[PDB]
């Protein structure tokens, strides 16, 4: 038993962190085959941050303007291009520890591991979800830019995030490994805010299924609901509306625990309305929306404690 936020082991990724320096700015970059990706804002400073122009700021740079370091060793650039919000730097060496990998764009609600890095040197690993407002509740200081987020299937790394910035609310914003931001955000320095966020309904229900799989039941009730009656309740309590695709996704977990979904939505509706009644679910006193259904399947037992 037990249920904890679990990150993927981070070895395969540690082998791809490198330091990238341009003038007076240093940040982490990602080294796959003979390419090294990093935030384009590495080439920037003074007011260069308030009103920049990277097409312009980048043409006034050459390959040897970038000092990519790999441990105490050193890599030389031989090409460079911008891709949307990232630089793609070709280098002389190809990464001996390059894992099988791919690049995907995760959707709000999905989760991934973050490897926090300073100066190309990995310091720590945590799990985080993409928040409906497209930001994450990370833990980064200055120097963390270029730290990446990822999942692992079998032996294959799916990169999905590269860190770029901290919003005024203290939450983070970044991009996939294609350079495209998640959210409306930009790598300028303006009055930007996180749009109001929402609790991830699919996940809370996945969580309650785990509470049951572990073997606790106290939040259940004899009632049921129609999708529609739930969403009317949910909307007020600031939840994302639930849809059929979501309901379908809670399929197997219904099966393994023998509890129908709309029945759990009723449980949920009740928890929203009655509060926790001074006890815990799976150790927590709030409702936990950062576990997906896939995260519950993977970590939880294949058989139920009935």
């Amino acid at each position: 038993s037990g249920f904890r936020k679990m990150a993927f082991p981070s070895g395969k990724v540690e082998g791809c962190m490198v330091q990238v320096t341009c003038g007076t700015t240093t940040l982490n970059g990602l080294w796959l085959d003979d390419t090294v990706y990093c935030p384009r804002h590495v080439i920037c400073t003074a007011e260069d941050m308030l009103n920049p122009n990277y097409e312009d700021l980048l043409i006034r740079k050459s390959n040897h303007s970038f000092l990519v370091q790999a441990g105490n060793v050193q890599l030389r650039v031989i090409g460079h291009s911008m891709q949307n919000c990232l630089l793609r730097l070709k280098v002389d060496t190809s990464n001996p520890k390059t894992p099988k990998y791919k690049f995907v764009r995760i959707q709000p609600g999905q989760t991934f591991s973050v490897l926090a890095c300073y100066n190309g040197s990995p310091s720590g690993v945590y799990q985080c979800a993409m928040r409906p407002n497209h930001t994450i509740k990370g833990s980064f200081l200055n120097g963390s830019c270029g730290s990446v987020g990822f999942n692992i299937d079998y032996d294959c790394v799916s990169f999905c995030y590269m860190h770029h910035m901290e919003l005024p609310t203290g939450v983070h914003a970044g991009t996939d490994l294609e350079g495209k931001f998640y959210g409306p955000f930009v790598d300028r320095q303006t009055a930007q805010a996180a749009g109001t966020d929402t609790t991830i309904t699919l996940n809370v229900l996945a969580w309650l299924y785990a509470a049951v799989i572990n073997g606790d039941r106290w939040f259940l009730n004899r009632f049921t609901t129609t999708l529609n009656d739930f969403n009317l309740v949910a909307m007020k309590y600031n939840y994302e509306p639930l849809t059929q695709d979501h309901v379908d996704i809670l399929g197997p977990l219904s099966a393994q625990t023998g509890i129908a979904v709309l029945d759990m939505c009723a449980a949920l509706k009740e928890l929203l309305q009655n509060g926790m009644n001074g006890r815990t679910i799976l150790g927590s006193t709030i409702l936990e929306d950062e576990f997906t259904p896939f995260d519950v399947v993977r970590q939880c037992s294949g058989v139920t404690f009935q």
Binding site: H41, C44, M49, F140, L141, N142, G143, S144, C145, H163, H164, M165, E166, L167, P168, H172, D187, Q189, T190, A191, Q192
Partner: peptide, 5 residues
């Protein structure tokens, strides 16, 4: 404004 980390 915002911190570009």
């Amino acid at each position: 404004n915002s911190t570009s980390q």
